[PDB]
Design a protein around this ligand. Sequence first.
Ligand code: HEM
Ligand SMILES: C=C1CC[C@@]2(C(C)C)C[C@@H]12
Length: 465
Amino acid sequence: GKLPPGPTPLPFIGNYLQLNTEQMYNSLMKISERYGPVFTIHLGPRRVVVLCGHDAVREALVDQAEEFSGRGEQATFDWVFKGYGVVFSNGERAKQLRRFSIATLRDFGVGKRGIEERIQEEAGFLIDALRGTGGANIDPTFFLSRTVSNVISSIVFGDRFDYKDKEFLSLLRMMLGIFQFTSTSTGQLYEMFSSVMKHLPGPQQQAFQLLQGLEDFIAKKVEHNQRTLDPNSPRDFIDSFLIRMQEEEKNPNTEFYLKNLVMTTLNLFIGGTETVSTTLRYGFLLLMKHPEVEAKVHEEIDRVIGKNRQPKFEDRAKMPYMEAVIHEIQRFGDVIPMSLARRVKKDTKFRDFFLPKGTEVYPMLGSVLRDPSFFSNPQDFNPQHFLNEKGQFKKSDAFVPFSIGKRNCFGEGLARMELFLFFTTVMQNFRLKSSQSPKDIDVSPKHVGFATIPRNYTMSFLPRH
Ligand code: HEM
Ligand SMILES: C=C1CC[C@@]2(C(C)C)C[C@@H]12
């Protein structure tokens, strides 16, 4: 056949005029009203197939999982990774690292009791640091992301950062800004015009330095691990990969060299931190906006764990209402609304379209999360989306915040755990009063580009009474 239809592109600038860089999501949703759920767009010179809604996205990413297992691009990030590392890599490189990483993560306790404790501990440290504010009005952004980043850092560096660490903050700051940048208008403008804007002055320059700053940190971290390596006992993820690097040194087709080490650790660092950090941060803002939902959450916590012992992960299966709330946040929040770009591994016949080898696919996860065929009033934050008539947890095939298919988020495991525990724990220990009245809180995002960024806010954590 021929390609998905779509608006007609002008030279160089592609479909710029039919897009609004500040609202990429909306702009493509607007166009889908004109061309159907499967269309082609032009982001500067990148010819992209946009997939929308539960069916289109599934049929590609799952039913034709192999054809769609390629990795497309994300210009800002790829500026630093240049195709190296587990995320922005392809083919042999990608299959190799993804394997190693899933396996290694698991070896250091992921999915098991080993990291559940590490999480329960760090959750401990948070409650402390929050009682430490003693009801004061604060921006939870860093409290949260400090706590999160510590779980992943615990794994990849083999040791948590102390909250006071002036560097730890520095780094957290950078991930925020990168994410923040890539969700701005200019950030999306950069996706289209990167081969030009890279040589120009502007926000992307500050953005580049932020990534270079993180690669520098990582690189300096790695070299310390080499210089102190016990090839018999790995302390952290970096060791495992180093240990493996040594083994593959004679094999010239090996995917385990230094660059891939640095970038995979960076990937794991950024990916493991800023996505969960942002989710929690949005959730709290929503919970405050629906005290109705806040209370019900407390009730189900008191009734199932009590203010007595600290929460355990299996404690999630007796608590549908909190599962429903975490889901509904993950759905409403829509942290990575357009996913990360995929790519077609070979020429592919999809429905009755023809997609060349190497064409980019933007799988609009948001459009699935908001598909009104699976969520009535998809626009509302309301946990009843994930609750049947009898107050039980009801799955949904459209709950795809971690994407689906051959390159889906292999952190979902870790992420689900981090998410349940932190939310539950903080709720057990505090009630939430906002710096404003629930009638005023504005929950709609400050930015939406590559990620969804909640607005900035302050809040107080008060004890329960
Ligand atoms: C709310 C939390 C998170 C969300 C919503 C999320 C979402 C996503 C999405 C949309 C993708 C792209 C899927 C695709 O290939 O099309 C992805 C992939 C990925 N995620 Fe996450 N993620 C989260 C947390 C994490 C965590 C905790 C880690 C590690 C600890 C992580 C590491 C990765 C990596 C390395 C990939 C690339 C997979 C590959 O290319 O094979 N993410 N995730
Ligand atoms: C390295 C990163 C930064 C953000 C990210 C998420 C979606 C895993 C793509 C991974």
